[PDB]
């Protein structure tokens, strides 16, 4: 089937270049034009450019115009975009779309995420949570200072999944994230596995009274 | 550099009912577009050229519009139907822009939150650093208060509040509350409570321990 696979996370700090990548698939890649959309989380989408491998053209937002570039290598049939001199506003998710016949893009890419920081990656310190309103009683763990994201929280591994509710990460004052991961279960073992790629901290715990 | 403002900023509706969210544009435009996206996942074409559905979407879905107000309708809420939609215009001009989008949340009753507080971890009692946290469990409408007490004193400024994505069973919300205070500040006090004010409570719960 037509498959768009974006290359994976990048922490680049700033002032610095990034160059990701959108493997084609599926599909006469030299045929439709591709474009790439920028997602600040809260500030919806932004049309960045689009490339038409079989000729090499590109069309750019002006706000990207210098920012941006788009490139193609019909022999791997991947698309390219490279961001230079990268600050924190340019901390967001690409995603990257196939135009297709009908003038909408009817494919996407999984996208990529861009953390713009200078500070190298930290990995978490998990602590538990001490196991009654509405007639349940709830126990779980604090994956805390963490940089960049994500962390995957399951419990017993993968074992435990009714009454689980992973929050979403928190920024803290000390600019490192850190998020709650808490299963609920009433009157009638319980183990977390914290797993964060960046820094390869794969941590379970046990949860006790 | 069109601006196209989307209303409202979010909504609820329960399945069955008509939704319709707006898009109005700053000035004149050829043609608009529409995008549903869900958490996790990339956006995914709904809507083309102002009124055509595009692959998989189904014919509860309709849009149409003109000049500066274009509208995306739903003839009768689903429960998969809970996503942002983005609008997106197009016209000679160069910049093709977006709306800030619509979050679709699902109606249903009010309902009161389940609170409980937690104590500091022994292990991060050793790292010098101490944090309480306060679970306020399966509630509706998302507005919940969380003022964080310690000896009766309100606190400020030392708290990190999340919140998850709607159930997609009982379309509930879960938030949390982290209270993070030097090891040295949280022996210097003894009573540590958790007051939280929601429209299904009465008056507010208040769940605590002593150190
Ligand atoms: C990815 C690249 C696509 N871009 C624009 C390009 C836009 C097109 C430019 C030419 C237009 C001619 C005509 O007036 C219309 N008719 C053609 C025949 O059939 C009936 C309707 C619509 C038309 C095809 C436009 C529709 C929206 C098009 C695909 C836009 O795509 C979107 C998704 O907005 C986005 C950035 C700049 C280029």
Redesign the interface.
């Known amino acids: 089937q037509v498959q768009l696979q974006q290359s994976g996370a990048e922490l680049v700090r700033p002032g610095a270049s990034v160059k990701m990548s959108c493997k084609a698939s599926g599909y006469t890649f030299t045929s439709y034009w591709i474009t790439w959309v920028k997602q600040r989380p809260g500030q919806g989408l932004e049309w960045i450019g689009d490339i038409y491998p079989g000729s090499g053209s590109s069309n750019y937002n002006e706000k990207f115009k210098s920012k941006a570039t788009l490139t193609v290598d019909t022999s791997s049939s991947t698309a390219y975009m490279q961001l230079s001199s990268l600050t924190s506003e340019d901390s967001a998710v690409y995603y990257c779309a196939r135009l297709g016949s009908r003038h909408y893009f009817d494919y996407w890419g999984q996208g990529t995420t861009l953390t713009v920081s200078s500070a190298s990656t930290k990995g978490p310190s998990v602590f538990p949570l001490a196991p009654t309103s509405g007639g349940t009683a709830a126990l779980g763990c604090l994956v805390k200072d963490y940089f960049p994201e994500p962390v995957t929280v399951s419990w017993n591994s993968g074992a435990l999944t009714s009454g689980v509710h992973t929050f979403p990460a928190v920024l803290q004052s000390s600019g490192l994230y850190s998020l709650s991961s808490v299963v609920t279960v009433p009157s009638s073992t319980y183990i977390c596995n914290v797993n964060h790629k960046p820094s390869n901290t794969k941590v379970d715990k046990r949860v006790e009274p | 550099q069109i601006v196209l403002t989307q209303s409202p900023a979010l909504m609820s509706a329960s399945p069955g009912e008509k939704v319709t969210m707006t898009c109005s544009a700053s000035s004149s435009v050829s043609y608009m ?1 529409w ?1 549903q996206q869900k958490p996790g ?5 709904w809507i ?2 102002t009124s ?1 559905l ?2 998989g979407v189904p014919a509860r879905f309709s849009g149409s519009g003109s000049g500066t107000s274009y509208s995306l309708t739903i003839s009768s809420m689903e429960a998969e139907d809970a996503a942002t939609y ?1 609008c ?1 215009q197009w016209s000679p001009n ?8 619509t979050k679709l949340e699902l109606k249903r009753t009010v309902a ?5 507080i ?4 022994d ?2 009692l050793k ?1 010098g650093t101490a ?1 309480v ?1 306060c ?1 306020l ?2 509630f509706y409408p998302r507005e919940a208060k969380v003022q964080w007490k310690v000896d009766n004193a309100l606190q400020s400024g030392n708290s ?6 709607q159930d997609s069973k009982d379309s509930t919300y ?1 938030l ?1 509350s ?1 209270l ?1 205070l030097s090891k040295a500040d949280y022996e210097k006090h003894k009573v540590y409570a958790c007051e939280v004010t929601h429209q299904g409570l009465s008056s507010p ?1 208040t ?1 605590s321990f002593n150190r």
């Open positions: 577009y995008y996942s990339p956006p995914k074409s083309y050229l055509n595009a692959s983005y997106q160069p910049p093709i822009t977006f709306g800030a989008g009161a939150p389940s609170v409980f937690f104590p500091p971890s292990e991060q790292s944090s946290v679970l469990n399966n990190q509040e999340s919140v998850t994505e879960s949390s982290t993070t719960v769940k």
